[PDB]
Amino acid sequence: RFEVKKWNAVALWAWDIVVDNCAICRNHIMDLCIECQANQASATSEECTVAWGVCNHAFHFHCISRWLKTRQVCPLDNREWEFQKY
Amino acid sequence: EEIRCRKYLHPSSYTKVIHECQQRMVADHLQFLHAECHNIIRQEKKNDMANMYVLLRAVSTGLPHMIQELQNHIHDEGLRATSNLTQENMPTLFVESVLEVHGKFVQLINTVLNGDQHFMSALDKALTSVVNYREPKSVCKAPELLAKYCDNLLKKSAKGMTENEVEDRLTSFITVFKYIDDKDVFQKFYARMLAKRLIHGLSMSMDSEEAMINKLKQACGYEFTSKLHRMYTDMSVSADLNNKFNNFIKNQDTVIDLGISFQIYVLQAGAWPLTQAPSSTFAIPQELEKSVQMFELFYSQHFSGRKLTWLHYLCTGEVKMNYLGKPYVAMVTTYQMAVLLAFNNSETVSYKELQDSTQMNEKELTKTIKSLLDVKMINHDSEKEDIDAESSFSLNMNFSSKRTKFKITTSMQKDTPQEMEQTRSAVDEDRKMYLQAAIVRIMKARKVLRHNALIQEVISQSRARFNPSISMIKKCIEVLIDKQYIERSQASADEYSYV
Amino acid sequence: LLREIKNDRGGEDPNQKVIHGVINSFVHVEQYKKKFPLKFYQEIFESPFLTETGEYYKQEASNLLQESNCSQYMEKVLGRLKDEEIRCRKYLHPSSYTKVIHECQQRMVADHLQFLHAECHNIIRQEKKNDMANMYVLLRAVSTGLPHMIQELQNHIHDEGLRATSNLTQENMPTLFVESVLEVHGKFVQLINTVLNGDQHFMSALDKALTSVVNYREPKSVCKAPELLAKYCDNLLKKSAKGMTENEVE
Ligand SMILES: [Zn+2]
Ligand SMILES: [Zn+2]
Ligand SMILES: [Zn+2]
């Protein structure tokens, strides 16, 4: 019997962003968010607005709201997050 | 004569009388002084050196020959003190010899030579030629020696040197490092060794590594140690990242019971010299999959927009040897961990079984099996001891050694010629890239150039990092020609034209 | 004649002297015409040839997208573009050198601008110095190919510059801010000197992006860049006991 404990693991993080893709959903910005992907029948597919910051980054409104609920920093660039468009 | 001119003549003619006296007593007999320069410098007569220096500074064209003689003497002394070195402690001996030569000659210049800037420049040139002791038909071994020196001081060891000893030894070492050309090789070698020290925990203290990185930044620039500081930052914030991951898994809506403790070391991909260029598809063992999926979910949540590549060869774990009555707990690599878990699946194993279970490449699997039989963790029940398609072994029941933890395989030192050749090849590729960048930039600035002028200005521009061999400039020019980014004149290859 | 040229595009080598002799015959006949001495050559051969290579490279471009991604598709197009310069040199009149190559670009790169620009984001962001080099020469020939790589490179610099000068240590903000933009400027002037031909179309995109990461105002705050750069000069122009020789300071 060989149980395993204390896995010291090393990984390389790299910037992987797709054009016109939500950085939290990892799907298209124009589609519904991963929170609105569930219960799609009840969702009206209108509340998922594409929010843009002063850094010209596109996110889903639900994703960026849940992000700002804990971290006030944009994920793609480590900057304080604003809103400019709807 | 100065006293007599002061007591007799006008104060406005003090310098003319002394100048005429020196131009008819010292400047006239210049050949005798330049002949005795060699003897005085080589046998190092302090008072005679000062007396010669004052007069040769007074004469318009007497100083430079003494400068050349001192430069040649320092070069000969450095060659005599840095080429007849041993092989057991070559980096430390090389650095200490260069420090001793530099210290004694700075003392000589500041004491019996008035600390002239020309002589300090000559000493710097002589020490630069000494440390760049290119053995014929070979490569310069100095950057590797300094990298090994840095690794030896900054690694935790049993020597007993405190933090202040590391600090002032590295502060002295910076003087040796400043004379070192081909700094790209040293940068890559120190990046590799710093990566090994940070990952494997061999660093004695993070403060010493930060201080050494800051010293190199002051000595060369922020662009020299940008990657090094990124590595240090990613290994310092890793504690906070692991704490955040633990807080995430302890605050999940559904309680998760993963039976492994983590010390995750997520690193930046663009800064560390590591790679996944080995094409081995290790996948994962069964027990690690749930928790690695949990960590990938956490990283997708708390650090969104980035994907992480798992360097399976640099990971490590602790397998409890609960088979033969718990002798100890073995510190292994995930390749060996997967092999041992495959043995835990069934007491009989095979090379085909390991191939279909761990999915590793044949070379890596053979290397791990060799390292396992070297530490006699396995018993090698098959007859042949070389590479085999049988690979039948359960376990060596005599492996009940006293130590509570064993490193059944080692990767800290290594320094195989393959990795050194790969590092030098990456150095050459970056050198070609920087050389062609310099070519395009300086011929955009000039727009009209010849061979010799372009070579000289490119050598001068590149001197902050390396001395560029003309064949490399020719190769990058040919690359730019083939990629139709440059078009030299069709009348002759000497003249050049923009685009 | 087109069949023995399409045979050359198929890999096999026909007789170069025979084909070039016949092609030159269509213009050597007209050598005694004062007005339009190439009208016969531009109607009998060149107009059918441009139509033939128009429907061949269009068929070739659609045949390359089936088994090649954008990284190696431009490697294959540059192979065809380089060969077509060689092929039309030894087969056609020198007056038709530009028309054949330009029409080849109108079927391999200009007809696939939607495909190349869609994959142009992944090329710039991952900094593939080989794929970005091949993408540049393809999009440079087309009139409207460049203004999407220029915008996509500016977006990358605006995002790389913003990441570099971000969460800087409060103790050494004036020094870290200047070296971070200089690192981004130094790195992204190298990629527009080797990968790109020092283009003022591209170097302005670097300038247009770096001026937006230096002047990045915090929300409900004022831009701190003029204050940081003022303290950077004051830090180094003071009496620096930590070395800082006058040659190194300059
Ligand atoms: Zn989303
Ligand atoms: Zn939604
Ligand atoms: Zn942002």
DSSP string, C122-149: HHHHTT-HHHHHHHHHHHHHSTTTHHHH
- Residue B372 and residue B394: Cα distance in Å, rounded? 12
CA angle B268, B273, B278 (to 5 degrees): 100
- Residue C94 and residue A61: Cα distance in Å, rounded? 60
- Residue C124 and residue C113: Cα distance in Å, rounded? 16
What is residue B320's three-state secondary structure? strand
Which residues in B lie closer than 8 A to residue C183 (C-beta atoms)?
Answer: 222-223, 226
Q: Which of A18, A77, A82 sits opposite C159 (nearest CB)?
A: A77
- Residue A22 and residue A48: Cα distance in Å, rounded? 11
Tokens 């530099």 — which residue? B102
- Residue A76 and residue A79: Cα distance in Å, rounded? 9
Sign of CA dihedral C58, C62, C67, C72: positive
Helix (H) or strand (E) holding B267: strand B267-268
Q: How many helices (H) and strands (E) does chain B have?
A: 20, 4
Q: Which of A19, A57, A80 sits opposite C219 (nearest CB)?
A: A80
- Which of C123, C166, C208, C214 to mutate: most A Cβ within 10 Å? C166
Which residues in B lie closer than 8 A to residue C179 (C-beta atoms)?
Answer: 222-223
Q: Are B310 and A11 in contact (CB under 8 A)?
A: yes
Burial class (CB in 10 A: 0-12, 13-18, 19+), C237: exposed
Tokens 């060799």 — which residue? B370
Helix (H) or strand (E) holding B268: strand B267-268
A54, closest residue in chain C (CA to CA)? C216
- Residue B437 and residue C193: Cα distance in Å, rounded? 5
Chain-centre distance of CA C158, in angstroms?
20
Q: Which chains touch A (3 or more CB pairs under 8 A)?
A: B, C
Taking CB atoms and an 8 Å cut-off, how many pairs form between chains A and B? 128
Give ion ligand 2 contacts, CB < 5 A: A 33, 36, 48, 62
- Residue C110 and residue C65: Cα distance in Å, rounded? 14
Ranges of beta strands (E only) in B149-263 are none
- Residue A74 and residue C167: Cα distance in Å, rounded? 12
Helix (H) or strand (E) holding B306: strand B306-310
Beta bridge partners of B230: none
Q: Are B296 and B308 in contact (CB under 8 A)?
A: yes
Relative to beta strand A11-15, strand B316-321 is: unpaired
Q: B366 CB contacts (<8 Å, ≥6 apart)?
A: B387
Query: Hey, what are B460's tokens?
Result: 């001068």
- Residue B488 and residue B499: Cα distance in Å, rounded? 8
Q: B375 CB contacts (<8 Å, ≥6 apart)?
A: B406, B408, B409
- Residue B133 and residue B137: Cα distance in Å, rounded? 12
Looking at the CA of A27, name the nearest ligand.
1
Helix (H) or strand (E) holding B330: strand B329-333
Residue length, chain C?
250
Interchain contact, A79 vs C121, CB within 8 Å: no
Interchain contact, C198 vs B444, CB within 8 Å: yes
C194 has a chain B CB within 8 A of its CB: yes
Phi, psi dihedrals of residue B398, rounded to the nearest 5°: -80, -10
C216 has a chain A CB within 8 A of its CB: yes
Q: C157 CB contacts (<8 Å, ≥6 apart)?
A: C184, C188, C205, C206, C209, C210, C213
Helix (H) or strand (E) holding B319: strand B316-321
Radius of gyration of chain A measured on its C-alpha atoms? 17
- Residue C241 and residue B218: Cα distance in Å, rounded? 13
Q: Which is nearest to B216 in space by CA: B200, B205, B227?
A: B227
Q: Which is nearest to B242 in space by CA: A26, C166, A10, C164?
A: A10
Which amino acid belongs to residue A46? E
Q: Which is nearest to B177 in space by CA: B210, B132, B139, B111?
A: B132
A19, closest residue in chain B (CA to CA)? B305
Residue numbers in the known binding site of A for Zn(2+) are: 22, 25, 33, 36, 48, 55, 57, 60, 62-63, 74, 77
Torsion of CA B356, B362, B366, B368, to 10 degrees: -70
Interchain contact, C216 vs A79, CB within 8 Å: yes
How far does the CA of residue C205 sit from the closest CA of chain B (Å)? 18
Beta bridge partners of B330: B319
Q: C212 CB contacts (<8 Å, ≥6 apart)?
A: C158, C161
Q: B349 CB contacts (<8 Å, ≥6 apart)?
A: B339, B342, B343, B391, B392, B393, B394
Which technique? cryo-EM
Which long-range CB contacts under 8 A does B484-490 form with residues at least 24 apart? B484/C137, B485/B440, B485/C133, B485/C194, B485/C197, B486/B439, B486/B440, B486/B443
Interchain contact, B265 vs A2, CB within 8 Å: no
Q: Which of A1, A9, A23 sits opposite B315 (nearest CB)?
A: A9
